[PDB]
Amino acid sequence: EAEASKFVEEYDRTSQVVWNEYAGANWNYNTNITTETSKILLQKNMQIAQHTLKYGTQARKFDVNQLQNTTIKRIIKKVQDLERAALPAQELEEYNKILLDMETTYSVATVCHPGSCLQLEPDLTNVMATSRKYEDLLWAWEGWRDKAGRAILQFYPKYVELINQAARLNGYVDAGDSWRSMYETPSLEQDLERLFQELQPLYLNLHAYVRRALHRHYGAQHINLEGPIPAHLLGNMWAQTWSNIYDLVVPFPSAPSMDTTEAMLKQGWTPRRMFKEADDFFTSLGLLPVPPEFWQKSMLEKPTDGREVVCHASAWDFYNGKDFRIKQCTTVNLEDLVVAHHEMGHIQYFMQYKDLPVALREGANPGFHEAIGDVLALSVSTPKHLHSLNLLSSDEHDINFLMKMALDKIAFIPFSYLVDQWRWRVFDGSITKENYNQEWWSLRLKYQGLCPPVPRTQGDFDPGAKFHIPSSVPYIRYFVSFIIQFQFHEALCQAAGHTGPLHKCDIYQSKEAGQRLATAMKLGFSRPWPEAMQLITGQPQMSASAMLSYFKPLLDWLRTENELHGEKLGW
Ligand SMILES: *[C@@H]1O[C@H](CO[C@@H]2O[C@@H](C)[C@@H](O)[C@@H](O)[C@@H]2O)[C@@H](O[C@@H]2O[C@H](CO)[C@@H](O[C@@H]3O[C@H](CO)[C@@H](O)[C@H](O)[C@@H]3O)[C@H](O)[C@H]2NC(C)=O)[C@H](O)[C@H]1NC(C)=O
Ligand SMILES: C[C@H](N[C@H](C(=O)O)[C@@H]1CCCN1C(=O)c1ccc(N)cc1)C(=O)N1CCC[C@H]1C(=O)O
Ligand SMILES: *[C@@H]1O[C@H](CO)[C@@H](O)[C@H](O)[C@H]1NC(C)=O
Ligand SMILES: [Cl-]
Numbered sequence: 001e002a003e004a005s006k007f008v009e010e011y012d013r014t015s016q017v018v019w020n021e022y023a024g025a026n027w028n029y030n031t032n033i034t035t036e037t038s039k040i041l042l043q044k045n046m047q048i049a050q051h052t053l054k055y056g057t058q059a060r061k062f063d064v065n066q067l068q069n070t071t072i073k074r075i076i077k078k079v080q081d082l083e084r085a086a087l088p089a090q091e092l093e094e095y096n097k098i099l100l101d102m103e104t105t106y107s108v109a110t111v112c113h114p115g116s117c118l119q120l121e122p123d124l125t126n127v128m129a130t131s132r133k134y135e136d137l138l139w140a141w142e143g144w145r146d147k148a149g150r151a152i153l154q155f156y157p158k159y160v161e162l163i164n165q166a167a168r169l170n171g172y173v174d175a176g177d178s179w180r181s182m183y184e185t186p187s188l189e190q191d192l193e194r195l196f197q198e199l200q201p202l203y204l205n206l207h208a209y210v211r212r213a214l215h216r217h218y219g220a221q222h223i224n225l226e227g228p229i230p231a232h233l234l235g236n237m238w239a240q241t242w243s244n245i246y247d248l249v250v251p252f253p254s255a256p257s258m259d260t261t262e263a264m265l266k267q268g269w270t271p272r273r274m275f276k277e278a279d280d281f282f283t284s285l286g287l288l289p290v291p292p293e294f295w296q297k298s299m300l301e302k303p304t305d306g307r308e309v310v311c312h313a314s315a316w317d318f319y320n321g322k323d324f325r326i327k328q329c330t331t332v333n334l335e336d337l338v339v340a341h342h343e344m345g346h347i348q349y350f351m352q353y354k355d356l357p358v359a360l361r362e363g364a365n366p367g368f369h370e371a372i373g374d375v376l377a378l379s380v381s382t383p384k385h386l387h388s389l390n391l392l393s394s395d396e397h398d399i400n401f402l403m404k405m406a407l408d409k410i411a412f413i414p415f416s417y418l419v420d421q422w423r424w425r426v427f428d429g430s431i432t433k434e435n436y437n438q439e440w441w442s443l444r445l446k447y448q449g450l451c452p453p454v455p456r457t458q459g460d461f462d463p464g465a466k467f468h469i470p471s472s473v474p475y476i477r478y479f480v481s482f483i484i485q486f487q488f489h490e491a492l493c494q495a496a497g498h499t500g501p502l503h504k505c506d507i508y509q510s511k512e513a514g515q516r517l518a519t520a521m522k523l524g525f526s527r528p529w530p531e532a533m534q535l536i537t538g539q540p541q542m543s544a545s546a547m548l549s550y551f552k553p554l555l556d557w558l559r560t561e562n563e564l565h566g567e568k569l570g571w
């Protein structure tokens with residue numbers, strides 16, 4: 001038992017050093033993709049793998065059955081998983097090279113007129129957000145898939161084989177089993193199934209109403225009122241959030257809405273301003289400010305020196321309890337303001353659990369890490385708070401704001417659900433490289449009710465064109481996040497003494513809400529996630545009832561509206 005204590009202590013001190021070095025090299029590559037940063041990264045990969053092997057080998061000689069202290073038990077059990085460092089050295093090197101090649105391919109892909117070349121951020125993002133011409137949206141949508149997704153296909157089978165091989169060498173049946181294990185919830189699949197089924201009323205009614213509005217704008221010949229919606233018309237490259245087509249679907253055009261983009265730009269907002277407001281919200285709650293070093297080291301806008309960066313927004317823990325950063329190619333708009341909050345939530349979790357042993361430095365489950373920033377950003381998005389930031393100035397405005405929120409939060413529920421339904425079946429072998437793309441579109445249809453605007457061909461690998469796929473980042477966390485963040489907003493709003501509809505709550509400055517969040521985050525991964533759930537919400541389960549309560553007046557409005565139009569929900 002004393003041997004077990006000393007071992008975790010040695011694991012902890014040596015992990016800080018090694019993960020700090022790795023984090024450094026990974027940072028330098030992400031913020032400066034060059035031959036040399038690649039090389040140093042791949043080298044630090046071998047270094048952290050040697051550490052993992054050394055300590056993971058030692059960890060496995062402990063019979064944790066026979067260990068009394070439950071924290072030591074749990075750390076040791078976690079270190080017995082070597083992840084990719086279980087692979088023989090040749091496969092390990094090939095695996096790391098595959099990952100690097102996939103990320104790089106995604107992050108440097110461009111789509112060119114025969115003409116100039118557009119990058120995903122900001123050019124193609126802005127095309128999907130703002131264009132209202134079917135054929136220009138199609139060009140951006142198809143081009144991105146031709147350039148990024150097809151180019152990832154040559155790597156993916158070998159990725160799958162190596163990640164699964166690592167999984168099995170750690171005791172899992174395949175990589176998807178390994179990922180699901182991180183929730184420590186054996187009823188996960190069924191729990192999330194029932195959660196998704198509870199949001200079906202709202203999603204199908206939202207889907208039908210947006211479909212009708214698309215029919216009105218793009219014409220009856222391009223929208224089948226009883227079919228799936230074409231995937232390039234929702235204002236976003238993956239149709240994962242639909243809030244960029246608010247203009248087409250406004251419930252009450254009579255209550256005109258403020259152009260928040262123009263307002264930000266006109267009022268001189270910058271990426272730094274955006275992050276300072278998120279920092280403000282957190283300290284308003286009496287949560288932690290980000291350190292001075294955060295502001296000197298983060299990369300908050302896309303470099304202008306022609307350097308290739310990984311633009312995709314991400315939060316960075318350097319594992320030393322002091323160095324925390326964000327790397328985002330921030331655009332000045334409300335969409336990225338929300339992303340800035342998102343990322344700031346991941347910084348706040350890193351700062352909150354910085355005194356735990358590094359093995360327990362994660363969220364209660366990955367969903368909790370994604371949820372923190374979003375919970376704040378729900379209050380940021382209210383008319384009350386946007387008014388205060390000078391970005392906005394009735395029942396009508398109310399239903400409009402709920403519509404604006406539903407286009408982001410409700411629409412992403414089936415997307416966030418489907419991504420790992422597909423990858424779990426890739427990992428378990430029931431989808432092969434012969435039908436990657438066809439099974440992806442069957443789930444796109446089945447869960448989101450979307451169809452590809454152009455028939456896909458052999459050689460297409462559309463999943464490759466979404467960041468988390470080449471980057472090998474689990475996605476079910478986002479589904480868990482979207483459910484639980486409403487539970488957290490509901491409990492925080494109650495802690496804050498809010499009364500009346502949940503959607504009017506704004507927890508800004510609430511020290512009561514902050515303390516609930518802080519005590520949960522301070523747990524890191526030290527206990528099963530139900531305890532952190534119970535600390536925030538007073539009960540231990542995930543539940544869609546808070547999200548349903550938030551959207552209830554919109555659900556009533558959508559049913560009245562869709563009923564009077566005779567919509568046939570579904571496809
Ligand atoms: C099981 O073991 C855990 C972990 O033990 C800690 O790490 C081991 C590897 C050894 O190095 C131990 O010496 C070491 O304590 C025990 O958890 C620890 O318990 C103490 C309370 O005794 C916690 O200390 C607190 O720290 C806060 C904030 O810094 C102070 O304000 C408090 O007033 C208090 O002193 C410590 O956080 C906690 N550590 C973790 C990471 O959980 C655990 O108590 C033990 N269980 C049994 C069965 O005794
Ligand atoms: C832009 C956002 N970016 C991700 C993210 O912040 O989740 C980035 C990349 C992968 C994970 N991530 C991190 O920064 C991270 C760092 C440490 C963690 N412990 C957890 C995450 C995102 O993809 N998102 C946000 C919501 C939807 C999803 C998406 O855009 O597809
Ligand atoms: C970018 O990478 C090169 C190659 O490793 C390095 O020499 C240089 O200092 C880095 N420059 C920037 C912009 O950080
Ligand atoms: Cl797609």
Ligand SMILES: [Cl-]
Pocket residue numbers: 179182366367474475476477
């Ligand atoms: Cl996950």
Ligand SMILES: [Zn+2]
Pocket residue numbers: 342343346369370
């Ligand atoms: Zn996140």
